[PDB]
């Protein structure tokens, strides 16, 4: 009988039957239905009658079982007395020669904090005063303590009965087996006795002595219990810069992340921390101790650095461990992050050296070039390293492989003015075999800026200019680029001037030069030719032309703040980006009142009628996410009764199977068809059910992408900013205004709120409230705001859309 709540009639029958097995099974079936929480008092006389005196342990044990989980509730066969049918003949049970029945009886009897059993539990310590097992003596210290807990904090429970009444706790210390139920409030002499016992311990018993009294002067003295306290005590005597090298903490710690890569990744972190405490700049974070595994002697054999190499990773162990490991290389050794990121990047970025680090997918290659290159932009020393490695990247000599390479290096030159003169000659080489945009773009920029340095350019450019591949974006990049630097410093059959001619043709003009350009018609609609066409005031010469622009870098460009940079090593970053970091007539009148922060729905129940409505009961219901914190409890609604009855309200619950409308309120009365009527007290909305939750800009952005929010409305009374009406109203449809999606200035400055919720509707809810408050001569519609809304199938989107207008209720009875 797993859980069957109607079966009590059969149990009575089964409980006495003249067959002992049946009786045991019955009583067992009662236990299992109560434990789940089901019907049990009908049976009581039957249950109690067979078992009572006997020394036959199994039925007695079963009855003994049922007296610690419901004795108080059941009363057919027990009623209320001092020597109840729980203990009257269980004084026999306590005083049987078999330890088990006595012991069991003692154990339940003393366990209860019952006051209708207080006297019978007190000399119940007799059953276990003699200690036939470790179990008997432990059973005794726990039972005396449980007696002490049960209203006997004074002389009824404190001395000895004949050996224990609160003194097993003392005795246990010096006896062969220990266990101290003495944790609080008990004899001082036993506490003292436990200390002595630390030495003459029994190990289970030591965990009991130890919860009470901890800290040792020793190293130990033995056993897991003492050992477990000991690592706590050690952390005290050296708190300083974490544990560093984990103590006896290490054993539990592995299981704490049994799923399976995460342990190594964690372990790797600690091992890296431990090596050294470095400068602790941007991603140079290694704490713990400065010297404890050093770094870098030149006589150390086979050195520290061997373990450091693991941390430099491509994936060399698996991805979770990889992400931890790349950060960890950066963390022990660099200048900041820059130094070790360049080494690390050199390995990752595409080459002709190894083909286990090159790939023909263009974005990844490109990104890897940008990561290597960002290190230079960060720190100078890296510029010198980067440029020759970049030329190796080029040497791959696939159209695309060159292409990616050329694209970053060209950015680097914008930063690094006439420093990378050397690269230009390498960069031209792979520009001729071509099937893509990227190669043309980049090459034309290097060869263009670099012209003073070289003289090749008609020849290199011209094979490509009459070759094909994909050429949209090529136009833009060649347009600003081709002439640049020194007015007449090249010549192969086209000097720098031919280049300016070319540069202009490629931009949007027409001219025979480099055997004509591939295309002329520019990239995306805004860019066009014209700016540059106007430009080249002084023909490709460092002055105030293309050259200027080329040998200068747009805004601030420093660090790895992503200003001509990309922020570490490209593969590690994907993982970091991913991390969102999300945090019968009846009359009612009613108002909601709050006194001393108690929120209640006031209801007055009125019988305007002369007719009888007796049988009157009042209930507030649990609909779904609405709940009663206590229904109105008066038996009112009688002939010409006016009553004030208070129903307490909650807003947060779990969905019930009954209707999901406004608030259900139920009054009952006389009638047999409609004994229960549902009638209303004032408004509560569907919106309550939504649950508020919040987003950060990353979670908002991810969800924006994840599912559409095209749906918009413009809501009146969003004249005001985010903070005022809009927040308060948004709150009531369990929403909250978080992070921005705005871009403010002297022409821009709609207030933008990123909203989130996680509705109990199988959807989230998100929105952006844009408040069109004029920051221009031509506003949208002046003050008002357009709320762009969604939910996960946009079923709550709509709630956001209208619950940001207005919202107010009041009455004054």
């Amino acid at each position: 009988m797993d859980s069957e709540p109607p079966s009590e009639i059969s149990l009575k029958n089964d409980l006495e039957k003249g067959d002992v097995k049946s009786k045991t099974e019955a009583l067992k079936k009662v236990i299992i239905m109560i434990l789940n929480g089901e019907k049990l008092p009908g049976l009581l006389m039957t249950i109690i009658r067979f078992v009572l005196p006997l020394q036959d342990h199994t039925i007695k044990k079963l009855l003994l079982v049922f007296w610690e989980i419901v004795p108080k509730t059941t009363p057919d066969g027990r009623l209320l007395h001092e020597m109840i049918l729980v203990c009257d003949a269980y004084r026999k049970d306590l005083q049987h020669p078999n330890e088990f029945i006595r012991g069991s009886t003692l154990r339940f009897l003393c366990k209860l904090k019952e006051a209708e059993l207080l006297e019978p539990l007190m000399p119940a310590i007799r059953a276990c005063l003699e200690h036939r097992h470790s179990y008997v003596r432990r059973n005794a210290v726990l039972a005396i303590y449980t007696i002490y807990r049960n209203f006997e904090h004074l002389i009824p429970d404190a001395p000895e009965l004949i050996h224990d009444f609160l003194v097993n706790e003392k005795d246990a210390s010096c006896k062969r087996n220990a266990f101290m139920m003495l944790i609080h409030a008990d004899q001082d002499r036993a506490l003292d006795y436990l200390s002595t016992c630390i030495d003459q311990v029994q190990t289970f018993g030591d965990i009991l002595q130890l919860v009470i009294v901890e800290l040792i002067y020793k190293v130990c003295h033995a056993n897991p219990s003492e050992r477990a306290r000991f690592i706590r005590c050690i952390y005290n005597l050296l708190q300083s810069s974490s544990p560093a090298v984990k103590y006896e903490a290490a054993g539990t710690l592995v299981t704490l992340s049994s799923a399976p890569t995460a342990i190594k990744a964690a372990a790797q972190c600690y091992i890296d921390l431990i090596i050294k405490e470095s400068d602790n700049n941007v991603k140079l974070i290694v704490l713990d101790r400065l010297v404890e595994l050093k770094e870098h002697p030149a006589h150390e054999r086979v050195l520290q650095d061997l373990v450091m190499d693991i941390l430099r990773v491509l994936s060399t162990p698996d991805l979770e461990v990889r992400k931890k490991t790349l950060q960890l290389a950066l963390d022990l050794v660099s200048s900041r992050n820059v130094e070790e990121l360049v080494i690390v990047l050199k390995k990752e970025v595409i080459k002709t050296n190894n083909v286990s680090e090159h790939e023909d997918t263009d974005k990844y290659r490109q990104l890897l070039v940008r990561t290597l290159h960002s290190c230079s932009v960060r720190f100078p020393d890296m510029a010198a390293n980067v440029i020759p490695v970049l030329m190796e990247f080029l040497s791959d000599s696939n159209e695309a492989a060159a292409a990616d390479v050329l694209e970053f290096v060209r950015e680097a030159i914008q930063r690094f003015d006439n420093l990378r003169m050397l690269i230009v000659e390498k960069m031209l080489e792979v520009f001729h075999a071509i099937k893509s945009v990227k190669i043309y773009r980049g090459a034309l920029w290097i060869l263009g800026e670099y012209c003073s340095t070289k003289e090749d350019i008609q020849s290199v450019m011209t094979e490509v200019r009459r070759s094909l591949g994909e050429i949209p974006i090529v136009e833009s990049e060649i347009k600003k680029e081709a002439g640049e630097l020194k007015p007449e410093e090249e010549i192969t059959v086209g000097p720098v001037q031919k280049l300016v001619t070319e540069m202009g043709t490629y931009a949007t003009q027409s001219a025979l030069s480099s055997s004509r350009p591939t295309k002329k018609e520019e990239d995306r609609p805004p860019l066009r030719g014209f700016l540059l066409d106007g430009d080249f005031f002084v023909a490709a010469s460092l002055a105030t032309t293309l050259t200027k622009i080329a040998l200068r870098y747009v805004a601030l460009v420093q660090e790895k703040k992503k200003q001509n940079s990309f922020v570490a090593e490209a593969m590690l970053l994907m993982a970091t980006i991913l991390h969102l970091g999300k945090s019968d007539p009846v009359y009612a009148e009613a108002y909601v009142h709050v006194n001393q922060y108690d929120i209640v729905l006031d209801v007055l129940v009125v019988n305007q009628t002369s007719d009888t409505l007796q049988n009157c009961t009042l209930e507030l219901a649990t609909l779904g996410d609405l709940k009663l914190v206590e229904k109105p409890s008066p038996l009112t609604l009688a002939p010409h009764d006016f009553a004030n009855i208070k129903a307490n309200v909650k807003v947060a619950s779990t969905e019930n199977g009954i209707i999901f409308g406004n608030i259900v309120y139920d009054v009952s009365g006389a009638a047999s068809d409609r004994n229960c009527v549902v009638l209303s007290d004032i408004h509560i909305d569907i919106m309550d059910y939504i649950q508020p939750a919040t987003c950060t800009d990353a979670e908002f952005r991810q969800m924006w992408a994840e599912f559409e929010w095209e749906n918009k409305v413009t809501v009146n009374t969003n004249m005001t900013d985010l903070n005022d009406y809009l927040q308060h109203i948004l709150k009531s449809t369990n929403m909250k205004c978080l992070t921005p999606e705005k871009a403010l200035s002297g022409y821009c400055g709609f207030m933008a709120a990123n909203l989130y919720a996680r509705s109990i509707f199988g959807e989230d809810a998100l929105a952006n409230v844009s408040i069109e408050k004029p920051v221009h001569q031509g506003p949208d519609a002046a003050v008002t705001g357009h709320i762009r809304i969604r939910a996960k199938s946009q079923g709550m989107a709509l709630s956001l859309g209208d619950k940001i207008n207005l919202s107010q209720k009041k009455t004054s009875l």
Binding site: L290, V291, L293, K294, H299, E300, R301, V302, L303, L306
Partner: protein, 129 residues
């Protein structure tokens, strides 16, 4: 009696350089145990061959691995043990950063907070001294 157990050991002068069951190469000076270096794996001291300028270690292999003994550290610390704190300071220009702070801490443990203050690179160790 020395803290780190001696799995195997060797005498270089009256100083005992030994391996430990922690994989630590330590040296005994003064009745104090200092760690000269950390061994990454389990290693045994074959002997010290002046020719190679090395201590020859062997793993499980009947082959050679070599650790040169860090004499400058050892001499700084040995001098400290003898209570020749000044003498150990002469060694200090050839004790690097964190090692000067450590050797300083050795000097200090033996005694004389001030001489330890001059050698300690780290300002914090100076500040406390």
């Amino acid at each position: 009696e020395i803290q780190e157990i001696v799995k195997t050991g060797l005498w270089v002068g009256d100083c005992f350089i030994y391996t430990s069951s922690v994989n630590r190469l330590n040296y005994y000076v003064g009745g104090e145990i200092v760690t000269i270096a950390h061994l990454d794996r389990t290693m045994y001291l074959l002997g010290y061959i002046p020719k190679d300028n090395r201590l020859y270690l062997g793993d499980k292999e009947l082959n050679i691995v070599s650790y040169s003994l860090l004499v400058s550290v050892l001499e700084y610390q040995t001098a400290v043990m003898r209570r020749d704190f000044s003498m150990a300071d002469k060694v200090l220009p050839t004790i690097p950063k964190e090692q000067r702070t450590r050797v300083a801490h050795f000097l200090e443990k033996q005694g004389f907070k001030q001489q330890a203050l001059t050698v300690s690179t780290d300002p914090e160790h100076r500040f406390e001294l």
